[PDB]
Amino acid sequence: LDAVRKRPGMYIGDTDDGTGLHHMVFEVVDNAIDEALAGHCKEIIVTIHADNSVSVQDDGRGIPTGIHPEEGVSAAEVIMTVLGVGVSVVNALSQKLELVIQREGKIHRQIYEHGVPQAPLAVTGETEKTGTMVRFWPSLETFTNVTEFEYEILAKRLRELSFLNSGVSIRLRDKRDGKEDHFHY
């Protein structure tokens, strides 16, 4: 991820005017929509948290957790740490990122800081559900001037995506003021 850290604007977009900041959400959402499409219920939930982080959840199968035979770490960690720009870019540019995967009866969790895994992906409990959740806190070392998520910028794009990905339910929630929307074509 050092090439991303060196020139963040070249991967994510302008880091001063809010472009890049919002693109971080859109990259995660692209992956969440792919995941939701391969499941039965087909819903994603995008939440703006009061602490300026965003989470994106899907109810798909869960991203793969098994050890990548070449890289020797979980497949999930490979996706997060190896170079759509890819979620690894989001991870590199987040001061914190939390990954939760529900798959094959188990909850799996991992935390990253500035793209660095804090421990290996780990099984933390049991579950009947399936899906993936990524929550990220954008790095305020990278993102300047515009540092807070604008609801309407996210809403506009999710609306466009709902028409293109018809049959996928998209929920948007703002925990700062309780604003919410439901896009479903």
**Catalytic (active-site) positions:** 27
* Helix (H), strand (E) at residue 43: strand 43-48
Q: How far is the CB of 145 from ligand 27K (least distance, A)?
A: 26
Instruction: Please state, in angstroms and as integers, the Cα–Cα distance from residue 85 to each residue in 28, 52, 80, 102, 161, following that order.
Output: 10, 22, 12, 25, 17
Q: Does 82 count as an annotated binding residue? A: yes
Q: Which of residues 116-145 bind ligand 27K (CB under 6 A)?
A: 132, 134
Task: Report if residue 170 touches ligand 27K, rule: CB under 6 A.
Answer: no
Single residue of 1, 25, 32, 46 touching ligand 27K by CB under 6 A: 32
Distance CA 85, CA 155 (A): 21
63 vs 155, which CB is nearer to ligand 27K?
63
Residue 19 CB-density burial (10 A; 0-12 exposed, 13-18 middle, 19+ buried): middle
28 vs 121, which CB is nearer to ligand 27K?
28
Task: Report if residue 155 touches ligand 27K, rule: CB under 6 A.
Answer: no
Q: How far is the CB of 42 from ligand 27K (least distance, A)?
A: 14
Q: How far is the CB of 99 from ligand 27K (least distance, A)?
A: 8
CB 77, CB 120: distance < 8 Å: yes
Q: Does 165 count as an annotated binding residue? A: no
Query: How long, in residues, is the chain?
Result: 185
Task: Report if residue 79 touches ligand 27K, rule: CB under 6 A.
Answer: yes
Give, to the nearest 10 degrees, the angle between helix 151-164 and helix 19-37: 30
Distance CA 31, CA 9 (A): 21
130 vs 132, which CB is nearer to ligand 27K?
132
17 vs 83, which CB is nearer to ligand 27K?
83
Distance CA 45, CA 131 (A): 11
Binding-site residue positions for ATP: 58, 84-87
- Residues engaged in binding ligand 27K (CB under 6 A): 28, 31-32, 35, 56, 63-64, 79, 87, 132, 134
